[PDB]
Amino acid sequence: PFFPPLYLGGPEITTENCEREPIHIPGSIQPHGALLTADGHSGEVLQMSLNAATFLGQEPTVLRGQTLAALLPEQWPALQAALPPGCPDALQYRATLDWPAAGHLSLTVHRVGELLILEFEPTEAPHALRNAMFALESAPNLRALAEVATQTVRELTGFDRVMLYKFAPDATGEVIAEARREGLHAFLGHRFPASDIPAQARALYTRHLLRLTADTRAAAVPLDPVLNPQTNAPTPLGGAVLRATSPMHMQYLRNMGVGSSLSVSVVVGGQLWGLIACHHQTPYVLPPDLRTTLEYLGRLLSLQVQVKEALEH
Amino acid sequence: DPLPFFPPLYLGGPEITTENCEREPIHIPGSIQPHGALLTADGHSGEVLQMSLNAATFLGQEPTVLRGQTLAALLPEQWPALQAALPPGCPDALQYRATLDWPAAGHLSLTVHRVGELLILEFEPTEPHALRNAMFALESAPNLRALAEVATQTVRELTGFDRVMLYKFAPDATGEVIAEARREGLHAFLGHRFPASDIPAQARALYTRHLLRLTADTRAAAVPLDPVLNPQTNAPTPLGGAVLRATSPMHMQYLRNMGVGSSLSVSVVVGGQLWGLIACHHQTPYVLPPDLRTTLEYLGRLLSLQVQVKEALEH
Numbered sequence: 001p002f003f004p005p006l007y008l009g010g011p012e013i014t015t016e017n018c019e020r021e022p023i024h025i026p027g028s029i030q031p032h033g034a035l036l037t038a039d040g041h042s043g044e045v046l047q048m049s050l051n052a053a054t055f056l057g058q059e060p061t062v063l064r065g066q067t068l069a070a071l072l073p074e075q076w077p078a079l080q081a082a083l084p085p086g087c088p089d090a091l092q093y094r095a096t097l098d099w100p101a102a103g104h105l106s107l108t109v110h111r112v113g114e115l116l117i118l119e120f121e122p123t124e125a126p127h128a129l130r131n132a133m134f135a136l137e138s139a140p141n142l143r144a145l146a147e148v149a150t151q152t153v154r155e156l157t158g159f160d161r162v163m164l165y166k167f168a169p170d171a172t173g174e175v176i177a178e179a180r181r182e183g184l185h186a187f188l189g190h191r192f193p194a195s196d197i198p199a200q201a202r203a204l205y206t207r208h209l210l211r212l213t214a215d216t217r218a219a220a221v222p223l224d225p226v227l228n229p230q231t232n233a234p235t236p237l238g239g240a241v242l243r244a245t246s247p248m249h250m251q252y253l254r255n256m257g258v259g260s261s262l263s264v265s266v267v268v269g270g271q272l273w274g275l276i277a278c279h280h281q282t283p284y285v286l287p288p289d290l291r292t293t294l295e296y297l298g299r300l301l302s303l304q305v306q307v308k309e310a311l312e313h
Numbered sequence: 314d315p316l317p318f319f320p321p322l323y324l325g326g327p328e329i330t331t332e333n334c335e336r337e338p339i340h341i342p343g344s345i346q347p348h349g350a351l352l353t354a355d356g357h358s359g360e361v362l363q364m365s366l367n368a369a370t371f372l373g374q375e376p377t378v379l380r381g382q383t384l385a386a387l388l389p390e391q392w393p394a395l396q397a398a399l400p401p402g403c404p405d406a407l408q409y410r411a412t413l414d415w416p417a418a419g420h421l422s423l424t425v426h427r428v429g430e431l432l433i434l435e436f437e438p439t440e441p442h443a444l445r446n447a448m449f450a451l452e453s454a455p456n457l458r459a460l461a462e463v464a465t466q467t468v469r470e471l472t473g474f475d476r477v478m479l480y481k482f483a484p485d486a487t488g489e490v491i492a493e494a495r496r497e498g499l500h501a502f503l504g505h506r507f508p509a510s511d512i513p514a515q516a517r518a519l520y521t522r523h524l525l526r527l528t529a530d531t532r533a534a535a536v537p538l539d540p541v542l543n544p545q546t547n548a549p550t551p552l553g554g555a556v557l558r559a560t561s562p563m564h565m566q567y568l569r570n571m572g573v574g575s576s577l578s579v580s581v582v583v584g585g586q587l588w589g590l591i592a593c594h595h596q597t598p599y600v601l602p603p604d605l606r607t608t609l610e611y612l613g614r615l616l617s618l619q620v621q622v623k624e625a626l627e628h
């Protein structure tokens with residue numbers, strides 16, 4: 001099963017009980033964005049991140065009464081149609097708001113049962129993706145495909161280190177390709193225990209295909225209330241990219257000297273084949289539109305891995 | 314019966330009939346569609362060899378001036394990028410794309426690929442979260458039918474085409490329309506089946522390597538290359554990989570007779586085989602700009618993946 005989260009007086013996590021930390025329900029988010037939850041029917045704002053006032057420019061109480069209808073007039077009917085009752089928690093809808101306080105915000109919404117989860121992040125506003133797609137497809141074998149993928153991602157993102165991280169049948173991990181800035185340790189060829197990515201993290205990575213820690217030293221921002229009014233239970237945040245990262249994993253990243261981390265799942269035959277894994281030495285908020293490019297690349301790599309593995313077997 | 318290609322018309326080959334379809338050399342027509350321009354150049358020196366006859370009007374230069382310069386001089390910023398992206402021996406399927414600001418012609422999209430020692434350069438005029446939203450909707454579709462319907466509707470919304478269908482090949486190469494989105498008033502092709510010879514065996518082979526083809530105007534005359542043969546080889550210039558390549562006059566007659574002014578289809582490739590087509594129709598001529606066509610190319614790949622996934626959920 002899972003332990004209760006901390007804020008419901010559950011045990012603190014150790015290397016004895018890695019597998020039991022309820023990473024989906026931390027009750028908090030990373031501070032480079034803001035999150036609101038809301039009722040599926042009424043559009044009634046039920047929870048907000050204590051930092052919402054910053055991003056939205058709204059007097060705190062104003063929000064926690066109001067309706068999405070009021071708050072987002074153009075958007076609220078689109079949401080209603082895009083995310084019908086009963087849809088999967090994996091389905092997401094995005095829009096760009098030109099919002100008074102903040103030039104442009106990206107809005108990302110998904111639905112978990114009766115709750116809409118809304119994420120707001122700063123945003124903005126060429127051929128590198130098309131060029132990359134053809135490059136991946138003409139790679140002659142899996143090894144070269146891995147090399148092209150890591151190089152392409154590094155060029156698109158500027159990340160200090162990009163890895164392709166392949167799982168063995170026992171969930172042992174192996175770095176099979178790597179693109180990195182001069183003057184970093186090489187992780188190429190190295191293998192790591194299964195517990196470095198626990199079973200509960202791997203399952204959630206099979207369904208929700210991108211996550212990040214924008215700053216490995218930033219404090220999480222609580223949800224208020226912490227419990228969903230609807231259920232008097234924790235809000236599931238696994239489908240939210242703003243979700244606070246596990247402190248265990250933040251400790252792991254800090255001990256390696258990483259300041260910003262991001263990975264993308266490569267899913268083949270319904271299973272987690274590996275990850276595009278990115279390190280930066282310093283804090284780094286990759287903007288939403290560039291993340292989208294990596295999300296596309298994730299799908300394309302999933303296709304090409306199967307194609308390429310089929311021409312060996 | 315499968316038989317080798319006839320020589321093209323310009324090398325004294327025969328004219329093509331319903332009898333000998335499968336032998337038309339549709340990859341070497343010696344000509345392009347008039348809404349863009351094409352140059353060929355030597356892959357090592359960058360000497361310009363062939364150009365479409367309309368090139369002066371896209372590029373704003375006399376032929377003899379174009380042909381008298383190397384790509385190093387014509388494309389000083391792109392020439393080194395081309396050479397890195399398209400190394401000798403690379404496959405003909407690999408494409409490099411850039412946007413140019415050309416004085417006379419505005420923003421041009423440049424698409425380049427390499428066939429042996431030849432570079433092929435295509436120039437076309439070029440111009441929010443719809444793709445991301447579509448990607449997730451496709452993935453959440455519960456079964457093959459719902460996927461097919463979401464895919465057709467999405468493509469129609471992105472493009473404005475009068476008719477978007479999902480054409481699926483059977484094992485005998487007969488095809489069947491299994492989903493479609495269509496303009497009000499058009500009659501339905503859903504569930505109709507069409508014989509294998511409608512897309513003969515050599516088109517289907519080409520459609521497995523080069524994943525998008527089109528006919529922007531089913532009545533437009535083709536524009537010859539000049540000279541027609543590659544001076545490197547005194548042989549035909551391979552245009553299989555060029556979206557500007559002229560459509561078979563057989564297929565254009567088949568389209569005009571249906572009332573179709575514009576045609577475009579994307580290959581859906583599963584396990585190395587052509588599974589089906591995103592086929593689109595417009596009643597009037599219609600040019601879809603290169604950046605919009607890129608969205609369809611990306612959806613072609615997504616759909617190939619999702620078709621595998623939906624079919625595996627099915628035994």
Ligand SMILES: *C/C=C1/C(=C/c2[nH]c(/C=C3[NH+]=C(/C=C4\NC(=O)C(C=C)=C4C)C(C)=C\3CCC(=O)O)c(CCC(=O)O)c2C)NC(=O)[C@H]1C
Nearest residue numbers: 014015018187192196197201245246248249252261262263
């Ligand atoms: C008690 C268990 C511990 C534990 C937990 C844990 N680990 C993650 C997530 C990740 N761990 C990763 C491991 C590596 N990253 C690398 O770069 C290398 C090699 C150089 C390794 C071995 C990765 C890639 C992830 C994914 C997240 C990311 O991209 O940064 C989690 C889940 C984090 C979250 O989503 O909140 C957890 C709970 N880690 C340990 O080391 C043990 C002691």
Ligand SMILES: *C/C=C1/C(=C/c2[nH]c(/C=C3[NH+]=C(/C=C4\NC(=O)C(C=C)=C4C)C(C)=C\3CCC(=O)O)c(CCC(=O)O)c2C)NC(=O)[C@H]1C
Nearest residue numbers: 330331334507511512516560561563564567576577578592
């Ligand atoms: C003598 C041979 C004939 C022939 C040849 C032919 N057909 C193509 C390409 C296509 N044919 C297609 C057929 C259909 N389009 C539809 O809308 C329907 C049904 C409602 C069918 C059956 C399609 C989709 C294509 C693909 C190209 C496109 O999307 O427009 C070629 C190759 C053309 C080229 O690439 O230059 C050839 C040679 N068709 C016949 O009917 C016989 C007489």
